[PDB]
Amino acid sequence: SVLNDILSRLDPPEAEVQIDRLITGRLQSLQTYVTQQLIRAAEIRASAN
Amino acid sequence: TLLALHRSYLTPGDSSSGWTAGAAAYYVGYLQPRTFLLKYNENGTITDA
Amino acid sequence: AWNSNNLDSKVGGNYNYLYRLFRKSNLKPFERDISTEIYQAGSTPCNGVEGFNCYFPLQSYGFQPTNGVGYQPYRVVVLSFELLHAPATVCGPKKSTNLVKNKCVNFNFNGLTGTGVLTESNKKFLPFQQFGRDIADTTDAVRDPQT
Amino acid sequence: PFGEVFNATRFASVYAWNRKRISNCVADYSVLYNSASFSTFKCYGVSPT
Amino acid sequence: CVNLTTRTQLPPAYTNSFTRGVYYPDKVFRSSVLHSTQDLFLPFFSNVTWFHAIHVTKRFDNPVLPFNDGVYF
Numbered sequence: 001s002v003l004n005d006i007l008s009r010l011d012p013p014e015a016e017v018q019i020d021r022l023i024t025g026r027l028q029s030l031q032t033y034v035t036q037q038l039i040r041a042a043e044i045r046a047s048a049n
Numbered sequence: 050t051l052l053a054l055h056r057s058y059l060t061p062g063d064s065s066s067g068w069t070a071g072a073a074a075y076y077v078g079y080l081q082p083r084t085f086l087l088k089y090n091e092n093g094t095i096t097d098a
Numbered sequence: 099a100w101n102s103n104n105l106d107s108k109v110g111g112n113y114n115y116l117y118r119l120f121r122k123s124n125l126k127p128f129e130r131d132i133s134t135e136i137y138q139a140g141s142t143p144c145n146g147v148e149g150f151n152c153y154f155p156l157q158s159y160g161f162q163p164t165n166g167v168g169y170q171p172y173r174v175v176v177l178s179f180e181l182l183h184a185p186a187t188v189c190g191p192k193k194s195t196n197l198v199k200n201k202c203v204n205f206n207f208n209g210l211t212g213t214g215v216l217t218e219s220n221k222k223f224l225p226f227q228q229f230g231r232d233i234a235d236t237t238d239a240v241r242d243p244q245t
Numbered sequence: 246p247f248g249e250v251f252n253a254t255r256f257a258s259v260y261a262w263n264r265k266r267i268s269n270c271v272a273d274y275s276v277l278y279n280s281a282s283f284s285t286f287k288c289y290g291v292s293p294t
Numbered sequence: 295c296v297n298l299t300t301r302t303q304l305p306p307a308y309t310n311s312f313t314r315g316v317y318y319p320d321k322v323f324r325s326s327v328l329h330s331t332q333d334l335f336l337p338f339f340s341n342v343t344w345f346h347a348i349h350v351t352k353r354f355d356n357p358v359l360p361f362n363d364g365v366y367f
């Protein structure tokens with residue numbers, strides 16, 4: 001899980017593959033949070049109106 | 050478990066019958082995989098689970 | 099892996115190394131069985147006869163000097179290790195540096211890499227635990243091995 | 246003690262392989278890599294360098 | 295091997311052990327937080343088998359017990 005550990009214990013060529021899975025997952029996690037936040041924001045926006 | 054024998058002068062005086070061991074006890078409980086919720090104290094001890 | 103052809107070549111010949119041919123079930127990972135027995139197949143078990151459908155547990159090698167190099171014996175050593183389980187005894191060649199406190203720095207403590215200001219902390223580490231973590235499971239405290 | 250395992254009087258047969266646990270020691274892994282007397286040095290999960 | 299004589303044979307006596315055997319699962323230390331770990335532990339309120347080595351008449355027993363997947367003593 002730790003990004004540094006992978007960087008520390010793997011080759012530069014080897015990091016194309018391992019880091020990529022981590023990055024893809026994290027973007028999805030971020031995407032879910034942002035999407036959820038907008039939906040929550042709308043409810044609050046409606047409440048504010 | 051290993052055992053302790055309280056050998057005295059009143060005993061017959063041999064390895065087969067000469068012993069007055071007295072009170073002793075132990076409990077054995079088997080362990081299996083389970084999920085535990087652990088609460089940690091401010092100091093760091095596990096108060097309850 | 100490596101070759102030691104010269105060491106494995108004897109005038110008399112070498113046959114003290116044996117690999118198993120047959121076994122009822124697959125061997126478990128990182129598990130070794132040196133039991134001396136003979137594999138039994140189906141009916142008519144040999145019961146030590148080593149007769150039809152019964153086999154001795156292992157077969158001898160054929161390492162010979164005349165033997166072709168391509169198929170000639172290799173010396174193979176497997177190095178296996180696991181990390182972050184506990185304090186690591188087997189550190190590498192790296193040389194230590196003086197501790198710096200309350201200044202942002204790059205610190206490698208026992209194979210752990212992160213970046214933050216380091217400051218002395220009051221928390222009572224019970225003698226047993228090396229690390230520390232916060233509510234969201236991120237490293238928060240460490241104990242310098244020398245310090 | 247990297248040396249004892251690497252240079253030794255005898256190597257065990259596969260049926261009963263020899264396992265050695267090395268602990269509380271500092272070992273320079275790079276020197277083994279530096280020698281290059283071994284045909285196969287594939288390393289998995291950890292960069293050799 | 296040497297032996298011992300006049301032992302009393304009785305059915306085992308069982309007593310409840312509750313909220314016992316909880317132990318620190320791993321090396322990390324945390325404060326004011328709750329973490330759930332899938333580590334082998336004595337299940338809470340699980341029966342434990344009491345044994346007696348007390349003479350109080352001619353009573354002395356130290357029988358072998360299987361250790362399977364973790365034992366608590």
Ligand SMILES: *[C@@H]1O[C@H](CO)[C@@H](O[C@@H]2O[C@H](CO)[C@@H](O)[C@H](O)[C@H]2NC(C)=O)[C@H](O)[C@H]1NC(C)=O
Pocket residue numbers: 247248249251252282
């Ligand atoms: C393991 O065996 C190797 C190969 O024989 C040894 O490497 C040699 O060491 C000697 C003495 O230091 C050197 O003069 C040679 O140049 C090295 N190479 C060879 C091919 O002999 C090594 O010293 C031995 N022991 C270990 C690694 O513990």
Ligand SMILES: *[C@@H]1O[C@H](CO)[C@@H](O)[C@H](O)[C@H]1NC(C)=O
Pocket residue numbers: 092094
């Ligand atoms: C916990 O820390 C507090 C600090 O006020 C101290 O008073 C108490 O004795 C400590 N208890 C244990 C069990 O360490």
Ligand SMILES: *[C@@H]1O[C@H](CO)[C@@H](O)[C@H](O)[C@H]1NC(C)=O
Pocket residue numbers: 308339340341
């Ligand atoms: C308690 O021990 C007895 C032994 O006969 C067993 O039958 C029973 O299942 C156990 N119950 C619990 C709750 O551990």
